[PDB]
Amino acid sequence: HMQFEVLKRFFPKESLKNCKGALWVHTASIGEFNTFLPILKELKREHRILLTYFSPRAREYLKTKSDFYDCLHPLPLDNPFSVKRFEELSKPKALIVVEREFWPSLIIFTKVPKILVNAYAKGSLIEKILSKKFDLIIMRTQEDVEKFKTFGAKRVFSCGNLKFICQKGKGIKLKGEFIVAGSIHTGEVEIILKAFKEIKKTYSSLKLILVPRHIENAKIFEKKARDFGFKTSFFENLEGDVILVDRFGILKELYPVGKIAIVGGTFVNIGGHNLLEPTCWGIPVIYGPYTHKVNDLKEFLEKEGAGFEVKNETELVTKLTELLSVKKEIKVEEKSREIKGCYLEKLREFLRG
Amino acid sequence: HMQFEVLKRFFPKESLKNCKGALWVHTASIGEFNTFLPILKELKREHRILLTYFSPRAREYLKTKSDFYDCLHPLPLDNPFSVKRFEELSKPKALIVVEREFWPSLIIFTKVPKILVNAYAKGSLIEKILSKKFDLIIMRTQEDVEKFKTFGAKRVFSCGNLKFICQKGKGIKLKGEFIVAGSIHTGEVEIILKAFKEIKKTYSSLKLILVPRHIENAKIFEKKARDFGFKTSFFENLEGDVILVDRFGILKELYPVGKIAIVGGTFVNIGGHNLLEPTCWGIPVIYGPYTHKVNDLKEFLEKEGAGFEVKNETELVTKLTELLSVKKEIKVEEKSREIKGCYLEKLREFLRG
Numbered sequence: 001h002m003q004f005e006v007l008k009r010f011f012p013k014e015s016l017k018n019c020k021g022a023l024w025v026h027t028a029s030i031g032e033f034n035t036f037l038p039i040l041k042e043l044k045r046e047h048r049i050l051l052t053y054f055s056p057r058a059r060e061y062l063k064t065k066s067d068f069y070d071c072l073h074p075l076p077l078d079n080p081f082s083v084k085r086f087e088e089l090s091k092p093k094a095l096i097v098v099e100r101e102f103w104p105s106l107i108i109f110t111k112v113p114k115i116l117v118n119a120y121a122k123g124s125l126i127e128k129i130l131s132k133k134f135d136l137i138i139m140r141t142q143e144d145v146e147k148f149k150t151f152g153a154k155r156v157f158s159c160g161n162l163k164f165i166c167q168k169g170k171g172i173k174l175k176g177e178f179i180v181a182g183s184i185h186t187g188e189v190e191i192i193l194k195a196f197k198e199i200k201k202t203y204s205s206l207k208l209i210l211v212p213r214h215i216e217n218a219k220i221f222e223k224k225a226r227d228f229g230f231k232t233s234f235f236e237n238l239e240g241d242v243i244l245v246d247r248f249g250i251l252k253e254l255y256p257v258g259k260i261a262i263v264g265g266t267f268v269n270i271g272g273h274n275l276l277e278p279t280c281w282g283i284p285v286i287y288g289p290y291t292h293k294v295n296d297l298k299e300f301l302e303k304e305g306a307g308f309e310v311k312n313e314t315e316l317v318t319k320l321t322e323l324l325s326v327k328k329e330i331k332v333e334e335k336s337r338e339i340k341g342c343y344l345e346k347l348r349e350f351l352r353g
Numbered sequence: 354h355m356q357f358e359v360l361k362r363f364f365p366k367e368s369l370k371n372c373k374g375a376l377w378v379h380t381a382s383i384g385e386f387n388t389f390l391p392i393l394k395e396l397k398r399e400h401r402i403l404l405t406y407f408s409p410r411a412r413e414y415l416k417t418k419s420d421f422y423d424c425l426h427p428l429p430l431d432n433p434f435s436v437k438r439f440e441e442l443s444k445p446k447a448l449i450v451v452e453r454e455f456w457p458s459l460i461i462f463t464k465v466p467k468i469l470v471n472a473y474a475k476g477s478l479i480e481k482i483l484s485k486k487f488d489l490i491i492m493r494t495q496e497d498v499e500k501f502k503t504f505g506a507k508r509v510f511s512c513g514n515l516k517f518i519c520q521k522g523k524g525i526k527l528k529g530e531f532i533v534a535g536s537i538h539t540g541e542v543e544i545i546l547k548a549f550k551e552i553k554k555t556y557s558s559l560k561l562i563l564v565p566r567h568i569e570n571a572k573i574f575e576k577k578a579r580d581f582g583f584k585t586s587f588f589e590n591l592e593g594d595v596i597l598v599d600r601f602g603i604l605k606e607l608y609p610v611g612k613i614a615i616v617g618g619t620f621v622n623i624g625g626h627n628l629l630e631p632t633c634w635g636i637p638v639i640y641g642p643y644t645h646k647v648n649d650l651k652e653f654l655e656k657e658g659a660g661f662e663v664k665n666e667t668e669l670v671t672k673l674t675e676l677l678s679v680k681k682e683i684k685v686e687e688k689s690r691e692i693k694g695c696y697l698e699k700l701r702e703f704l705r706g
C-alpha cells in the first residue's frame with residue numbers, strides 16, 4: 001500500500017529541472033521534518049525549497065505540508081549516477097541535511113555545498129570520513145564540536161538541540177487554579193488521583209485537568225475519579241475537582257492554565273510523552289521514572305530546573321506541594337529562542353554566499 | 354544509539370569471505386524475519402545461512418537469533434560496487450528476498466540466482482523491470498502470479514501468504530469452560546464484560562480469561578469486572594468468573610484453553626492485534642470492526658470461516674451464542690501446513706539444482 005518510489009529514487013524525475021537553484025533540505029522522516037520546521041519556516045521566506053525525505057512513511061505526511069516547500073522528491077538511491085542525476089537536474093545552491101543521514105554516495109558524489117544540522121558525534125570511522133565533506137556543521141553540544149574538530153572538519157559550531165525549540169501555539173485561558181496532567185495512561189491514572197486527593201487536603205480550590213493519552217478512555221477515567229470521591233466534569237465545564245478532556249488536539253493549548261504539569265507515559269513502562277510542552281509556557285513538569293524514550297529531553301529539563309522525576313505517589317505528593325508553595329522559575333522558552341536564533345543566523349550567513 | 358553500519362553497507366566486511374557458498378537470505382526487518390522464520394528453520398538444516406537485513410532496528414533482535422543463521426551482515430548499500438564486493442567476498446549460491454525489497458543495484462548487479470518469496474503485484478513500472486531478474490518468484494495469490502506472468506517472469510507460482518503460517522508453541526491446559534479475550538484495551542473492556550454478562554445468564558459455568566494489551570491495566574480491569582458483578586481472580590487462580598492475566602508472554606499459550614477467542618485492538622480505533630493465534634488451535638475468533646492494520650489477515654480468516662466481525666455489544670452476544678451452541682470447525686492449521694509445504698518444497702527444489 002505504501003509508495004516506495006524506487007524508480008524515482010533510482011532515476012530522479014525530469015521535472016526537478018523546474019526547481020533549479022533551490023535550497024535543498026533533506027529530512028529522513030517525519031521526526032526530522034518536525035525537528036527542523038521552525039527553521040524551514042524562516043528559510044522558506046528567502047529561498048525556494050527543494051524538500052527530500054528517505055522514509056516512505058513521510059510522503060503522505062509531507063504532502064500536507066506543501067506550504068513549507070516548492071518541490072517534493074524522495075532522496076535518490078545511494079549510487080553515484082542516481083545522486084548525480086538528481087543534482088544535475090535540480091542545480092541546488094546548498095543541501096541542508098537534518099541530523100545525520102550519512103549517505104556516502106550522496107555526500108561523496110555531489111558538488112553542492114553541504115550543511116549538517118543538529119548533529120552529535122559518535123566517534124565512528126564513517127564520521128571521520130564523511131564529516132569533512134560538509135562545508136558547515138552545526139552540532140548539539142560543544143563536546144560534539146570538539147570531536148568533529150579532531151576529524152579535521154572546518155566550520156563546525158554548536159547551537160544546541162533543535163528538538164528543544166518551543167512551538168507554543170495560541171494557549172487557552174481559564175478562570176481557576178489548575179494542575180494539568182497530560183497524556184495519562186490507564187496504569188498511571190490511579191497514582192495521579194491518589195496524589196491529587198492527598199494535595200486537595202491543603203489546596204481546596206485546586207482543580208486537576210486530566211487528559212488521557214487516548215481519549216477513548218475519558219469515561220473510564222471520569223468514573224475512576226468518582227469512585228475516589230471527586231466532583232467531576234467534562235471540559236468546557238470546569239465545575240469538577242477533576243475535569244476530563246475527551247477531545248484530541250487540545251492538550252498543548254491547555255498547559256498554560258496550570259501552575260504545574262504532569263506528563264504521563266512515565267509512571268508505566270511506556271518511555272514518556274512530550275515533556276517539553278508545559279515548560280515552554282514557564283511551568284514545571286513532573287513525570288515518573290520511565291522516560292527512556294525522551295531521555296535527552298528529560299536530561300535537558302533537569303539541567304534547566306524545569307523537570308522533576310518522582311518514583312511514586314508519596315514523591316509526587318511531596319513534589320507537588322514543593323512547587324505549589326514556592327513558584328519555580330523556568331527559562332526554557334528563552335533557551336528555545338536562543339537555539340532557534342543560533343541556527344537561523346549561521347544558516348543565513350552561510351547562505352549569504 | 355542505534356548502529357547504522359554505514360561503513361559496512363558501503364564496504365562489506367572482509368570476513369564475509371569465511372561465509373563462502375552460503376544461502377543468502379534477506380529479511381528487511383523484524384516483520385520479514387518472523388514471517389520467514391518457519392522456512393528458515395528448515396532451510397538452516399541443509400544450508401549455511403548468510404542473513405542480511407536493512408533496518409538498523411533489526412540488528413539487536415537478530416543477534417538473539419544466531420541459532421537460525423551462520424553469518425549476519427547488513428545489506429550492502431545500493432551501488433554497484435558495494436553490491437558486488439558483498440557478492441565477491443561471500444560467493445552465495447542463491448539469494449532469497451523476503452517480500453519485496455526491490456533494491457535495483459542489488460537486483461541488477463549481482464549474478465547470484467535470486468528468489469523472491471511472499472510477493473504481491475502492485476502493477477508498477479519498477480515491477481515490470483525488476484521482476485524478470487528473479488529466477489524464481491513465489492507470490493501470495495494466483496491473481497498476483499497472473500500479473501507478473503504478463504511481465505515476462507518465468508518461474509512464478511502461488512503458495513499463499515507466509516504470514517498465515519501458525520507458530521503455536523506448547524499450549525496450556527486448564528480444567529473448565531472458557532472464552533479467552535486477548536489484547537483487550539481499556540476502551541474495549543466494557544463491551545466485552547457487558548456481552549459476557551448477558552452470556553452468563555445462559556452459560557453459568559463459562560469463565561472469561563481477560564488479557565489486557567498492557568499488563569499494568571490488570572488491576573483496573575479487575576475492578577471494572579467487580580463493578581459488573583463478577584467474582585474475579587488473577588491467573589493461576591481460576592476461581593473468578595473473570596480471570597485476569599497480569600503477566601506478559603502467555604496469551605498465545607492460553608488460547609487452546611477456550612472454546613472461543615475475542616481479540617482486541619478492534620473495538621477501539623487501533624486497527625487490530627494478532628487474530629491468527631487462536632485460530633491455529635482450531636478455535637474461532639471474534640473481533641470488532643477496526644481491523645484496518647490487520648486486513649489481509651482479517652479477510653483470510655473470514656474466507657476460512659474462522660473469523661467473525663461484530664459491530665457492538667448486541668452482535669457480540671449473538672455471535673458468542675451461535676458459537677457456543679454449535680461448534681465451528683476451523684481448518685487454519687491445515688491451511689498453514691499447506692502454505693509452509695508449498696514454499697519449502699519449491700525452495701528445496703530450486704536449491705537442489
Ligand SMILES: Nc1ccn([C@@H]2O[C@H](COP(=O)(O)O)[C@@H](O)[C@H]2O)c(=O)n1
Pocket residue numbers: 182183211212213214215247248249250251252273274277
Ligand atoms: N489526549 C491528547 C493526548 C495528546 N495530545 C497532544 O498530541 C501530541 C502527542 O505527542 P507526543 O507523543 O510527543 O507526546 C502532543 O502535541 C500532545 O499535546 C492531545 O492533544 N490530546
Ligand SMILES: Nc1ccn([C@@H]2O[C@H](COP(=O)(O)O)[C@@H](O)[C@H]2O)c(=O)n1
Pocket residue numbers: 536564565566567568600601602603604605626627630
Ligand atoms: N498480555 C499480553 C498481550 C499480548 N501478548 C502477545 O504478544 C504478541 C503481540 O503481537 P500482536 O501485536 O500481533 O498482537 C502476541 O504474540 C500476543 O500473544 C501476550 O503474551 N500477553
